[model samples]
Target chain A: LQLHSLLSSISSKEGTYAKLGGLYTQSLARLVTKCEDLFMGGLKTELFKLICNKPCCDSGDAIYYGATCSKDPDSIYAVKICKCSPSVPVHFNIQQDCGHFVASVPSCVVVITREVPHQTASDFVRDSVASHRAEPEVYERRVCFLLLQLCNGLEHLKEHGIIHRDLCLENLLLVHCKHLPRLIISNFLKAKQKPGKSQARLAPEIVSASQYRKFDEFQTGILIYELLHQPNPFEREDLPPLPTLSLYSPGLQQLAHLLLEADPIKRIRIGEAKRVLQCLLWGPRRELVEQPCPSEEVLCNTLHNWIDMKRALMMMKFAEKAVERRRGVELEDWLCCQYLASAEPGALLQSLKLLQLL
Target chain B: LLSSISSKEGTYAKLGGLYTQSLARLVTKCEDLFMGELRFDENSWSLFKLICPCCDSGDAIYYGATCSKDPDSIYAVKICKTPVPVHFNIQQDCGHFVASVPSSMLQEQDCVVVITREVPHQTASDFVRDSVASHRAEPEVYERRVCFLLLQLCNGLEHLKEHGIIHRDLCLENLLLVHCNPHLPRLIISNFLKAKQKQARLAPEIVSASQYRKFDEFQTGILIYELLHQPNPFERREDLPPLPTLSLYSPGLQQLAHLLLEADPIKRIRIGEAKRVLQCLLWGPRRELVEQPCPSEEVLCNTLHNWIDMKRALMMMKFAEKAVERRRGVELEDWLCCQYLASAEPGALLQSLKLLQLL
Candidate 1:
């Protein structure tokens, strides 16, 4: 979670870690020299040699393989090459010059990123589940952790205003980390600034050929279902029924059901989904507001120490109603906003009564 | 893989002391049943009203409940959303052999209904974890209670062994105490759900992935260590840590722990031998007899010499040697003195520890 917290504020220009922010902003603004040096004058140069004769992965149009940098001998890059094109075109010069390679890749239109030694999510899940030697809890923890990492990646992509429309188990790669495996969101061929046509991997809106916009959240739901249930839900003619139940814990199954809501309006967003997954990994958040109190006096008294109880109560009631009107905000998050809105006494009674109704 | 049991009236015989009964025969046997016959609803154990969440280990959710058939009687119910292997065998075997065993949890097709009268006053884990400070304040009482519970656990495990079953997963959490009374608590050995899967309680042989015997003996050692120590030494890592030097514990207890927690399974003591050894020793202080002063090391050496020669205890000495070699931080004197304590007279244990300078 420390890493998660760091990643959350990584893009921000202002934060507690001044040096971290300074260095991050500095690296993002670095000139083309470093980027050119890292790739060694356009990845196709002799400095970069293909490690494998055959592509490690092939998506028909493009093929990928491990390419070692001779200059930086220890470093390797995932070099993808295509005959025609991959996806939406962008400024390779601007990206290469700004050293924004961490967020954007170019050239294979030779998109060379760090090489992940382990298997893709699709293969990882299939192999892990297939092995009978794995303990039940061990297997479940690994699956949940990997999914949590993917959720983090999705948040990063959303922050960057990019949609991995073709997000699926196959597109996610696992990195061989020391304790838990790190997930790298790969295969951005169908990636875009807005939203493609992985019919098998598509959301219900895309699958139905309706003029509805698709998001990564829907595809993420499919990935979760695929991980838990094994056989890809969309591999067959029809999508598997929503709200899947498997040998996994009830919390995980509940998460899958929430994310897989066919109605985009009802489906959980990435941030909300992330919170649910966090709760599963770590116990529930310990904030007092997150939990319902038995009486208004107790809650108001608790809030009185921090702020006006009346104002706090008003904020909570309004936040709760706003949550009801909107289709997405979670209950815990709404409660959180009451305290966040601080800046409430009948208002306390009103909110307390509303909570009691629940 | 499914084996079929069938026969005509003349063809049927009790083979392997087990005979299969048909539905008609079972119905006739239960013909005299009444009153509590309507305890169950069509699909659920609606008879028991769930009171509150007890413990949820992700695999199953346990709750405190009150039986509708007898509202005055309290019960504990565990819910399993999915079906597991036939744990009914454990229920049957334990019931037959264990005197203090608890059961009567119905197994349905989907949702499992597990009910027990023992409301779990406190798990052995909770007691051991939360009472570290209390244990220090009243070491004598703690040791006595632990010894009493440990002996009971040995008996239960001995029964499981007799039935050729292994309590594969035996952790502190699985052991339940029925009463909250510090001195007069009844130990209830529950969670025979060997239904699944930690490497912490595993013997070194099992951890190394080598061919090994499937037994609960190693886990028994772990339980003893956990009972005495705050947390398990082997909980966080594969390598076992040396037993902590706790002054409050008896030398006999320490030696017994070392014997059972032998890194090499070849040197590990059997549960039967452990039970026999435990039966001969005293758990608590005697009221009639006063505490004896510390005996000299020379006195103990002469005592050991005389005792060993008197009984041809060369084999026992050799056994102690092997234990010292395989177990971490264990000395030959520790094991030898434990034997001295077990075999010697009532007050000899206190003298053994004092003379050996372990006290």
Candidate 2:
């Protein structure tokens, strides 16, 4: 009786089934048209490969073929391969893989992949110095290396009329066992095209005339401040502890003063900063060079130097507070006083005396 | 007797009320038939002759015979008799006027009027200047010119205020020189099209009333400074005030400085209170020339000079500080000082310095 009832229900639903069948056939035809479009797109991609030496590949086994390596739960590795010489090999620890390919005969292919750095510069800086406090020498060397890498990459990008709008430490990747750190310069999704190009990029939404004017100064200031006083200004309490002014060296303070001018016009340009850093790093009026020291001594010296440097910084801070209270001076005046003060041991007091003379 | 009869018939036709009635009465009663016909024939012939050749040669004349039917319309009948006059419109004689002016006058003057019509083709600037200058020479006309200039400035300010434009470039040099008569001195404000409206907001320290006071003060200060200092306070290269710092001074001094040292514009102050300030300073107390005691002489002699010198010294210090701050990558308080100085009188400056213990 149940079987007969089921048969009756099935027979009654035959018309609906027939209608569904017809709809399915129509959908299938539409899908076939879509497939044709995809095929044509793939063909164009192939043509692009031939012309530019940029490769396209399926989600798996692309990493071995010199394409950017990416992975998903289902696929072990997905990559794209192109027939071009690689100029730089980058390793990233993210889910996505990115690489550049030879668009012309002159340009080389860039390959980007994901990998965890055994040790980062931040980690190195934090560990080498005592409790993440760096001396003037340690700070100078680290900054110099970072700046040199930045300038080289900047020169190349600027030559191509490309500006790296988001230049921060996180975007930079240090490959395992690699001597030179690779500046990946990610976040090109908002990258602008050179002016006069048909598809030129508009100015970034974050940029303003005033901000643009002060960008170099502000960034350098923040960077120097961070290097001297480790951790970050904007970080929350739960994060790693921030460095105090007491931990900063006199040289670092001077550099910080040069970096963080409120007036954008007054901010040090890259060339000027380089000159100043060179002087500080290699001794006064010396050229910038890599002076290799044993890793352990460099680490120990950084810690010892940080403590000694803090003594000078504390004195300078005291003088700044004194000047502020006495003269009812503004922050800028205090900052100037601090810089002048740190230039010599008794210079800050002398400056205050000079003000009295005036 | 026949002529009398024709005139009576013509009068009757003229007195007829309606066209239809006149036509009907004329046709039915045959009233003034030959006289009317003669009048119509003469008018037709005159119009036809006007449409004919020799009309262009100016051979036209009026006939004594008026339209008999209407008694209102008259026609000029072409007589085709005499030659036309050589000259007609004196206003149209461009060639004669061009040859009249001496070559030396034309060469020496930056501008020359080409008389195409009765009026000469003078530039708008030249016209206004000459007009104002002429009016200024005569007391009655000068008052009128003043009224007009004030009206223009008010209208300009109203428009500018509405549009949020700062006519940073207000001055007399921009005003046009014109003539009430060809030789009379007259001047007027012209060339408003190039005027700039500053769109930036005033710094929080400056109030609107204070701002106005500063503007006027600066106008006066600049004039005074220019007269006393010579070659203009701003034109001097070594001790010039920074543009942004100028706003920090008191509104009065700012106004004065704006007249003198307006860095954004080098040649502003072409007219208005600014021009007057310059004139007053350069010419020395308006009453000085009239042989009257100068009102501000006591204030000037006792304190104004020292105050001006102190302000000058302060401005120089501010400039030096700004330069050092810029080099050291720090901000400066020069602008703040400028605002204070502009608003502060000599006494105020001393008071403030004493209060701040800078004195």
Candidate 3:
């Protein structure tokens, strides 16, 4: 009731939120209002925008506007308001299991899920490796935990006769619910309620009508392979491999071999994979190897004194041109020459000549 | 001998043939220190030893061999004996020190930190080296190239002078090539981190100066004169060479050179004025030394005409340059057409073609 004045009597569907010449667009108003009313549910039903204090990725239609619910504000649940525009709905079984009659929309498909914030698999490995300061065992433990949770989620889909089909880093979202970690498989866009995969994590199967079983188990092995060495296999397929004690507790050599069992028909089941992970978790040396990771949920709540440690640590792009400026080598090197060229005229032209360059 | 160089009890060498005995020891010490580290390129043994790239002005820098850190990426590493706290602290002031000038140069933070970088494929010393290889080559090209390079060096010193900075050690060796390409002008001025370095001085005022400016200008003048074609005049000098022959250049440039190499530190051209005169010679005729904002189009067409045309017409050919230039040089026919169409009057294409012929 305290936030009653902030809430509008107008229903969300009454009008499109393009404010009439208010200088500030209605979308901008909603954004600021989300920041201001952090404690208030964004217009009831126990849901409010979660302000993660980090710039959300520049994805217009489908965005994670960091919100928590009043009924379970301590619990992380975000409303994924994907614009159901230009609809070509094949099948969306995302919220197919969760009871959700409290929603009605004309233009958008709003599905609420008890999922964690925007930190996905990539961020998980990045932070986990960094937090452990590149300890071999620490990274392996986190990777093990990730696989365990991943199979469990896939097992959930498997029970629903759903195989993720499309399994990759971005889709395997890391979440926290009920103070327990959750690895939710998202971006179910390409699902057929059966088996399939992307060329990125492709299994050399199908080519005919396919069944589900270990289709994604092989994909998980590839995922685990990446999680270990942390290289873009697509970026360089000619690159080498990496490991663990149970999984790649130190190496991934044996575990990857087991999981990526060339013959998909012979690949281990999700349940069997989880059991190995379980053994690793409950094993003797868990104390030093398995330190608790500071999950993304912590970042959303605390805004002060935060430095993206991974971003701060290494000069990530290597010799690659910066994403911002693409012309001269890259922005920094260009600036290097710019400062030089500006410092002295002949430096630029002379350099252009001596190097037999223009 | 090692005992002479070491031992807590040795007072500053005096009366016992101090300069010689100690200098011999100093040579031995430096030798051992170098051999101590030996900076051997682990992969290839021959790539390890540095046989002086002779033309280097201060300390001759060399390229070091490497591994999956990729030879193309981690190109050169300079060897230094010890880290001076002031120098290392300045190096560590990565935030403040890199506010203006920047490059791919990296510093390994620890005892005796050596600076490394992926530098231009060639340096000014290489220019000298190449000229020597061609048996003195074309004097006209060398003269023009040297003047152009002098203009560049002065241009850099101009920035330092303006910022009240003095590259305490301004010499040919210090001015290394900095582009990623073989074709780009590689001469970059280096060693700007330390406080006023001694030993490279030439001005009579080195007899009475510690401030950054005079020593910088006087030595820079020596660089111009020396690299303009002569060995270092400061090397136990007897007869100093006359101002690098005025007949070789335009009157304006010769006069600037005269003023720079003035010999009398008190009377030498201030770096600002020196830079100004060099600018007019390169860009204008009798240009004023006072700073001004961007000139009007016609003025730019006059003041920076050569630069603008050469840059925009860069549409053909590729060089690993760090400039905003296209990888390839300008496409000639298209460029000529673009300029011709953009010109207010006809015949602009002919003018640019004429400029291209000049280059």
In order of appearance, the predictions have TM-scores of: 0.34, 0.23, 0.29
* lDDT score, candidate 2: 0.32
lDDT-best of 1 and 3: 1
In the range A52-146, model 3's lDDT, one tens digit per residue, is 44323212334454556566667645556554111122111122212223345633565554443556676665556554445666556666667
Two-chain complex of model 1, DockQ on C-alpha atoms against the true structure: 0.01
* Candidate 3 residue spans exceeding 4 A from truth: A1-358, B1-57, B67-72, B81-115, B120-126, B129-137, B162-165, B191-194, B197-212, B231-253, B263-266, B283-359
Pick the winner on TM-score between candidates 1 and 3: 1
Q: Give the worst 10-residue stretch by lDDT in candidate 1 chain B.
A: B92-101
Q: Which rank order by TM-score, best down to worst?
A: 1, 3, 2
Top-down lDDT ranking: 1, 3, 2
- Which stretches of model 2 miss by more than 4 angstroms? A1-140, A176-184, A197-217, A229-248, A285-358, B1-359
For residues A1-358, write the lDDT of model 1, one tens digit per residue.
4366667776875553544433333333332223223322211111124465555654332446776644334445666554312332222111111111222344325555444334666767667655424465566656677777677667766765667677766666655532465566665556666432533777776656532233788787777767764454545113444332323355565666666677777766786666556444432223555567887567666644443333334345544755565534332332233233321333433332222221
lDDT value, residue A337 of candidate 1:
36
Give the range where candidate 3 chain B is weakest over 10 consecutive residues by summed lDDT.
Answer: B88-97
Alpha carbon lDDT at B117, candidate 1: 50
Which tens-of-lDDT digit does each residue in B193-282 have in candidate 1? 552222289677655523334356677777777887545656511255544554434554566666677777777767755654453334
**Model 3: how far is A234 from its true place, Å?**
58
Query: For model 2, how does the per-residue alpha-carbon lDDT over A230-330 read when each residue is reduced to its tens digit?
Result: 64443401223323333224444554555554555765555445434433332221111123335533433332222223222222232222212132223
Per-model DockQ against the true two-chain complex: 0.01, 0.00, 0.02
Best by TM-score: 1
* Native contact fraction per model: 0.00, 0.00, 0.02
Q: Mark the regions of model 1 whose C-alpha exceeds 4 Å error after superposition.
A: A1-358, B1-44, B56-59, B81-113, B180-182, B193-214, B230-249, B263-267, B283-359
